[PDB]
Curated annotation (Swiss-Prot):
Widely expressed (at protein level). This is E3 ubiquitin-protein ligase RNF213. It is linked to Moyamoya disease 2: A progressive cerebral angiopathy characterized by bilateral intracranial carotid artery stenosis and telangiectatic vessels in the region of the basal ganglia. The abnormal vessels resemble a 'puff of smoke' (moyamoya) on cerebral angiogram. Affected individuals can develop transient ischemic attacks and/or cerebral infarction, and rupture of the collateral vessels can cause intracranial hemorrhage. Hemiplegia of sudden onset and epileptic seizures constitute the prevailing presentation in childhood, while subarachnoid bleeding occurs more frequently in adults. A chromosomal aberration involving RNF213 is associated with anaplastic large-cell lymphoma (ALCL). Translocation t(2;17)(p23;q25) with ALK. Atypical E3 ubiquitin ligase that can catalyze ubiquitination of both proteins and lipids, and which is involved in various processes, such as lipid metabolism, angiogenesis and cell-autonomous immunity. Acts as a key immune sensor by catalyzing ubiquitination of the lipid A moiety of bacterial lipopolysaccharide (LPS) via its RZ-type zinc-finger: restricts the proliferation of cytosolic bacteria, such as Salmonella, by generating the bacterial ubiquitin coat through the ubiquitination of LPS. Autoubiquitinated. Changing E540A: Decreased ATPase activity; abolished ubiquitination of lipopolysaccharide. In mutant B1B2; abolished ATPase activity and localization to lipid droplets. Composed of an N-terminal stalk, a dynein-like core comprised of two catalytically active and four inactive ATPase domains, and a C-terminal E3 module. The ATPase regions do not generate movement but rather act like an intricate molecular 'switch'. The RING-type zinc finger domain is required for the ubiquitin-protein ligase activity.
């Protein structure tokens, strides 16, 4: 309407106007109105021409003091891209900032970092973050803007980059406006979202492609295809493992070798070759390789500080100790470095692999051996065997001379932590962790070898600096283990050494940032007062898209672009729920419930790509690909452990209400049978946890409390239509509420459960009868 009206009025009679539409949607209003005007010579340019055009426009003149000076050829815009995660995009921007601080002679060169976490790009948040810089001091001073477009972003990215980088502008509801100044550099950190034409939109831009180690060796210098950073290669993390490995592979004697601080040897290429050979991953990222290096460095450092490697002090009975240490630790790293996950490419199990751990205790005089035993063979060599089955885990980890020597040193080989007493377990565990006192915080937490190994894994990751991301079902033991460890390290002190955040779909980035900053203050306080490390724990973190913020906290070690303060003692753990899909029968039952769903699986926008989330047992969003190599399974809750927790709950009830042992037995057996049946019945129940047993016990307790009145009213009601144990009766009604009602195959459940009930109540019919009578009484 307005176009036609203006054309009727005194206007530009040579106006140049263009409209552009998506052919699939072209049937709509504005393309329809001008269909006659449809232009059939669609303008196009080859990618190289657009590249040269934008590169010319981005090029900052030499006279202009610009952050661009560091970038390729004074381009005030750059894209840093990777086909996968953790290959040096943020590192590249860091080094760019540093080089800018070196070159530009400026007292301060601001870095602004912006995280785009929302699936649909929020340009108003970007504008809000940039507006502080509208001040004039910045208009003639270099500033670097780093915009990280996390994996969480799915839509709005190309439009946003077009407007900001090309149109040089952003604008909001109120009317305040951002102008992209050429004196400032813009770098976009993005993962190449390859799925679409012969060229990706990002290619139009000055791009840096950061490459992984294997691509760095194979393909290779340039600033648009960086290799191994020299500060990292010259860092202790790479150099100690590199020097040790360099000697190891050549079969040199390490009996004398000791890494001298600040030393640097070899070349980036040889270091990468050795790391990739031993790493265990075929095409690792740089993060996986640093985690490998960081682990091997920490443990080799502790070995160097130990007495078994001190100036001899033991003669030569320990010849080959460092050779053994390097071999074993390269094997041990397999658990910490290697991924455990391989639309639903995200799954594996904990019991699938051994966890042979060796630790150097903070006393620098003892070692801890867990998860494996040493067995001598006829060939004079010593092998690593599974402590459970005795099967060989790794052959020739050491020679028999070193085994006998280490025995003479009282090193605790072949220890069976499952047969040890409680306090001996606590002593070994605390010594390994570096705790002086075996202050047992929970006698019901069973310190089995597996749980101790889990604790020690979390500990090593805390020590070296590998992020801790654990995957497990609800009630598999994560929160109790973390609590146990926090309490053990606390040692009775009155301190808040652990903060637990229960993450939900509504957990926003600002909530995570605030929680982390609060935990950081709390940790500074705790370390000052009590000298205790602090844990922050995110449970159900994948449940939110703000999980990308959690990635920043775990991997990037930052908070909304601001860095985390080391010297805090704050450790972060994240627990992610698993990625499972409901069975097809179960999805049928769900789609058939009532009038069915309001939206079909096709029309949904709530999905994990191909999968609607309602078809997932857990509403979980996709993991940032950087966290994928780090997630390790906590393990499934064993039948023995389930029964033990049920027994603990029923006994807690016994003390609360003074039941007998017969009722305890029956309640335990019926709760176990109920959980078993619901687990087997994958067509009606996909989710089973101990929270359901707590709920059923709560209901049982409620029925037991009221049982006097309910049984009186029941006898009266039934007399109107002219004996019972309160415990078995309340159990039956609790079972009714928790399991029997939601079910469709109620009869099979009652048949299974009845067998555990004492006579004469061991009948499915009596069970249904009592449930019916109680329902009637409640209607009456
Ligand atoms: N030469 C190297 N190149 C890249 N990363 C390296 C190198 N040497 C060590 N690293 C480690 O790899 C990690 C790379 O993290 P970085 O912030 O670059 O990841 P990223 O490129 O942001 O990936 P994503 O955005 O997917 O997390 C750093 O923590 C760094 O310590
Ligand atoms: Mg990054």
């Amino acid at each position: 309407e307005l176009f036609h009206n203006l054309c009727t009025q005194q206007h530009r009679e040579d106006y140049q106007l263009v409209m552009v539409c998506d052919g699939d949607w072209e049937h709509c209003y504005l393309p329809s109105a001008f269909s006659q005007h449809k232009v059939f010579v669609t303008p196009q340019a080859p990618l190289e021409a657009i590249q040269a055009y934008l590169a010319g426009h981005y090029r900052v003149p030499k006279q202009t003091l610009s952050a661009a000076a560091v970038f390729n050829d004074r381009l005030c815009v750059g894209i840093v891209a990777s086909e996968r995660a953790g290959v040096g995009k943020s590192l590249y921007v860091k080094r760019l900032h540093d080089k800018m601080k070196m070159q530009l002679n400026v007292k301060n060169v601001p870095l602004k970092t912006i995280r785009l976490i929302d699936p649909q790009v929020d340009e108003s948040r970007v504008l809000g973050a940039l507006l502080p810089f509208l001040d004039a001091q910045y208009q003639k001073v270099p500033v670097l803007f780093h915009l990280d477009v996390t994996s969480s972003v799915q839509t709005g990215i190309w439009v946003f980059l077009f407007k900001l980088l090309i149109l040089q502008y952003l604008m909001d509801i109120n009317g305040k406006m951002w102008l992209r100044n050429p004196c400032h550099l813009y770098i976009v950190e993005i993962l190449e979202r390859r799925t679409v034409p012969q060229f990706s939109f990002l290619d139009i831009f000055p791009k840096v492609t950061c490459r992984p180690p294997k691509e760095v060796i194979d393909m290779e210098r340039s600033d648009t295809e960086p290799g191994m950073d020299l500060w990292e290669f010259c860092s202790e993390t790479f150099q100690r493992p590199y020097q040790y490995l360099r000697r190891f592979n050549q079969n040199q004697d390490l009996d004398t070798f000791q890494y001298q601080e600040g030393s640097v040897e070899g070349t980036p290429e040889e270091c990468l070759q050795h790391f990739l050979f031993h790493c265990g991953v075929i095409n690792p990222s740089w993060s996986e390789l640093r985690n490998f290096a960081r682990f091997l460095n920490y443990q080799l450092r502790d070995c160097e500080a130990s007495l078994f490697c001190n100036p001899s002090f033991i003669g030569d009975t320990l010849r080959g100790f460092k050779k053994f240490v390097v071999t074993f630790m390269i094997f041990m790293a397999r658990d910490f470095a290697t991924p455990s996950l391989h639309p639903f490419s995200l799954r594996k199990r904990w019991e699938s692999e051994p966890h042979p751990y060796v630790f150097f205790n903070d006393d620098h005089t003892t070692m801890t051996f867990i998860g494996f035993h040493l067995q001598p063979n006829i060939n004079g060599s010593v092998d690593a065997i599974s402590h459970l089955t005795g099967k060989v885990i790794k052959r020739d980890v050491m020679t028999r001379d070193l085994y006998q020597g280490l025995l003479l040193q009282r090193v605790p080989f072949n220890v069976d932590f499952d047969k040890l007493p409680r306090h001996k377990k606590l002593e070994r565990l605390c010594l390994t962790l570096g705790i002086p006192q075996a202050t047992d915080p929970d006698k019901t937490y069973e310190l089995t070898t597996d749980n101790m190994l889990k604790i020690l894994a979390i500990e090593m990751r805390f020590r070296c600096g590998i992020p801790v991301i654990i995957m497990g079902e609800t009630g598999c033991g994560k929160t109790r283990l973390i609590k146990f460890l926090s309490d053990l390290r606390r040692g009775g002190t009155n301190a808040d050494t652990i903060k637990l955040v229960k993450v939900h779909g509504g957990t926003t980035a600002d909530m995570i940032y605030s929680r982390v900053r609060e935990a950081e203050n709390v940790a500074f306080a705790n370390k000052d007062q009590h000298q205790l490390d602090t844990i922050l724990f995110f449970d159900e973190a994948n449940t939110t898209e703000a999980i990308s913020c959690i990635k920043e906290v775990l991997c990037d070690h930052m908070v909304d672009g601001q860095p985390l303060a080391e010297d805090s003692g704050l450790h972060i753990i994240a627990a992610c729920n698993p990625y499972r899909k409901h069975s097809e029968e179960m999805i049928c039952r769900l789609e058939s419930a009532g009038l069915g769903y309001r939206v079909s699986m096709e029309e949904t926008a709530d999905r994990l790509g191909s999968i609607p989330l309602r078809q997932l047992v857990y509403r979980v969003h996709a993991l940032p690909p950087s966290l994928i190599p780090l997630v390790w399974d906590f393990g499934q809750l064993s039948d023995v452990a389930e029964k033990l927790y049920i027994q603990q709950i029923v006994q807690r009830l016994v003390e609360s209400i003074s039941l007998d042992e017969n009722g305890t037995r029956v309640i335990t057996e019926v709760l176990c049978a109920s959980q078993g049946f619901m687990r087997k019945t994958e067509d009606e129940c996909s989710f089973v946890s101990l929270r359901d047993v707590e709920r059923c016990v709560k209901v049982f307790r409620w029925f037991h409390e009221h049982s006097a009145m309910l049984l009186a009213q029941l006898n009266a009601f039934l007399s109107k239509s002219s004996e019972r144990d309160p415990v078995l009766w309340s159990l039956m009604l609790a079972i009714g509420v928790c399991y029997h009602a939601s079910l469709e195959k109620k009869d099979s459940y009652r048949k299974a459960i009845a067998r555990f009930f004492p006579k004469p109540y061991d009948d499915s019919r009596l069970l249904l009868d009592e449930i019916t009578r109680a329902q009637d009484l409640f209607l009456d």
